[PDB]
Amino acid sequence: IRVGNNFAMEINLNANLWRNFLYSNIALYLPDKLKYSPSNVKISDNPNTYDYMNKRVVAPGLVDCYINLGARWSLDYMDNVNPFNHHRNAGLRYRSMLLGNGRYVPFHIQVPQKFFAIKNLLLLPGSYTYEWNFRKDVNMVLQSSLGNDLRVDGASIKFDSICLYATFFPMAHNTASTLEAMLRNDTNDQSFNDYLSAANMLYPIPANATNVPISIPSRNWAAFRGWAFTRLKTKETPSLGSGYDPYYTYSGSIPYLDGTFYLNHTFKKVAITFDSSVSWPGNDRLLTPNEFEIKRSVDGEGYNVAQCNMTKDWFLVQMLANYNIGYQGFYIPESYKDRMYSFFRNFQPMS
Amino acid sequence: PTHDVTTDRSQRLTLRFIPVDREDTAYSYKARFTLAVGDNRVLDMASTYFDIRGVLDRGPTFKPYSGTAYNALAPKGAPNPCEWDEAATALEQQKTHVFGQAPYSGINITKEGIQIGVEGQTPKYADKTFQPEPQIGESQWYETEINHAAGRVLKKTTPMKPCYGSYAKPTNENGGQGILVKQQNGKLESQVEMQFFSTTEATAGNGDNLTPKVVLYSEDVDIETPDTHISYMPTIKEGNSRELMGQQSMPNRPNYIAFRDNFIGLMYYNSTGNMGVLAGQASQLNAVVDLQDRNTELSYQLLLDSIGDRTRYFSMWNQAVDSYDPDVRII
Amino acid sequence: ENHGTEDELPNYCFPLGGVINTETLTKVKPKTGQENGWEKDATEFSDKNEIRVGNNFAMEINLNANLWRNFLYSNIALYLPDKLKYSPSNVKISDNPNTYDYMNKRVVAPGLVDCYINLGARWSLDYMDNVNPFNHHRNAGLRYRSMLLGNGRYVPFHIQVPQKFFAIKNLLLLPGSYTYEWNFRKDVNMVLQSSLGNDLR
Amino acid sequence: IRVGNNFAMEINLNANLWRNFLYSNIALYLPDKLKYSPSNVKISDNPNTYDYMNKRVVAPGLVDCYINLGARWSLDYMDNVNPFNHHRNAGLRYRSMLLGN
């Protein structure tokens, strides 16, 4: 017979689950400078090896269940760390599972043609040569949620056989002949233009740098269209020019190629000057008629909007350039204009 | 419409072009094709694509499943039932200490081990290989005296490991584990020793039926820790020791590996060193002039975003798009 | 909609030491000649060893039911009309039935809404039917703004408001000089919105 | 007074929660040729009675947390099993709760 209540033990569940999720999905992705090496356990010397980032320990106390409690506010240390290099990357998860789940995996894939000149070209009768080159660099053609230097680990890729497939519309011979004749005049000539329509250039920035100057010599700016810029981690954009670039010891996202930029909130101001004397928007258009003040931190004249630290001029410029919105009152643009890479969809104020 | 659309003569839809020239390299691969278009049809290049196949080795550091795979439910500090040498202070005397369980509840214990059951009238004994299986145990919550107990415990030869994530490949179809090394003609006999135990109270039982109360089957398995790493090794020194009993494990970080979205970078784009060539075979002047300033990959990415929704997955072009979980970027 | 809990399997806590109720045992060797003889081990093997007989000691908890019960309580039970809740014992409670303290120190018995309410039924509780449903801490529209201002008590702020009057919300103002005075409201209960409706004033 | 740390017991949470999802949502829907009849408990002879489909037991070892780990896979036994005759059917759930309980 038992006297009194039954012996039993207690445990908080929801708090424990929250701690587990928070630790697992954030605290392990802090910048390495906050983690410390273990005790009595041998670790890899190379910091890019999977082993180093796996056996490196990070204290749970940095991010416990009570971090910025009650507040919607991304951590400081993480907003510079790439967020796509994360084992919860839905697309990366899908692709990795689609290939399989083992270490050794045969594959049979179909690669499209992306070069804009021939991407949608309507090839006519004749005998045409067609040759292309393919990389076998694991660090380049593979993606890893941790970005570790794969070729140091021992990832390898080998091609067995490559074939070309093309589908012909079984067009009636008479109409096909008429179309072929009509498409070889001097007038009915096909045309194309690259969708980005750009001219990428890149500029190094030293560590702990604040200002970045830039110059272009006496060009001719005819039919110029506009600017577009962002910021990348040098440890990641890869040197496209040669073949194997030995030095690409990182295997995560490639914001120069994947289009997944994440360092866009680190810009402060932009100044544009033609002939070293005139400022381009400098017809007293903006509130600060010489700079595109993006985020002014200290200054409190009352120029920031959206209950954040982006200035009114910069917000107006972004909205105008993306959706022609701003001269007749701000309002959420339609989903049909705000694509996934559009400005508004990724604008997240915090406090 | 009836006429002037589809031809009646025997005409194919998909044509498969065998490569004519191919060259391997330590870091690249070149393929060349002779694209021939019939004399009465028009080919839309958009439908063309390069079909590849080969061997991909993801390497030792590809772990797509977060968390462990072996004894996940076990406590992260629970040690495998093991024996180990230990310095003895009684009277380099290295006595061995034993730590392990005994879930199986047999009938009788003799010098041939526990009596699993009876066959006809002859008592039957468990196989040294697997019969005291770790999984099968007593199935009554309320305690009942067990006068004959059996279980498995690793010998001191095998290194000690936490139960969390420890695994050793099986050797015989009955699901046992155990190094099958034998030094004879039939050099595959299992070396499983039976160790006997009784109550510490039973000391003056000479002549008395000092029956062994618990019999342990000792093994030597090829223990592995595939996806877990020790998070706390109390003592730097190697070997097996009472100190090492408290080591705790932890699952290794998840790590996914796959191809780039839209197979980015697999083809050589915007590098005039290795530039694709398309030209009428009569001449040979390449009709694809590519610069290093243009960025074709990003351009195609933005174009795909512009046309279709960038959330549906198309497995053919490997069109799944990278994206973070918004509850992770912003806490 | 209480579809129940998928707790088919049992969930067990365990000792972090692998096992607890061990029994101290001594190794015993078979004798010679005597089939039933047995002599204690003299060769080096520590005569005191911890071994467990039978299954390991453990405790049980239904996780998937506890999660549902906590959710039900924290999201419905605390929001029942006050006439059901009873005041606590030996605790000094406020008197104003609108002060946050009164809404916080009032204890509502879990038995009103537990795991077994309308089992398998899609049916809002009659009591909660008339209770304002937006006055709830799960109000995403409220939560977004509350975190947008910040999680502190003392919050410096900077906002932009629109002009909503239909007659001039879209007037195309032609050139000239105009006066555009407008009033504003300082009442806390009107410009601030609480999840519980407590009288901020 | 207590000497040393406090008494405590450990339980893996997320792993156990997944066992259930898997078990209770898949392992009970495997074709009957895998499930085996119970012990010392009666059961209807008719294999279409609810009692037959309920009393019959299926070992958890068939589908535990470690099945095809990391692989976006559908169990072979479940490829031909009807996937709509499942208690998670949203439409069926709605239509059943609409009438009542």
């Binding site: 999720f21 989903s335 049909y336 | 918004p326 509850d327 | 999660l67 549902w68 799960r138 995403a140 | -």
Partner: peptide
């Protein structure tokens, strides 16, 4: 119910109009 109940509630919220007029 393993989550942060954040984006989860907003996603529950997404059961409303989107594409056109």
């Amino acid at each position: 119910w393993n989550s942060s109940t954040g984006q989860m509630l907003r996603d529950k919220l997404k059961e409303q109009n989107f594409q056109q007029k």
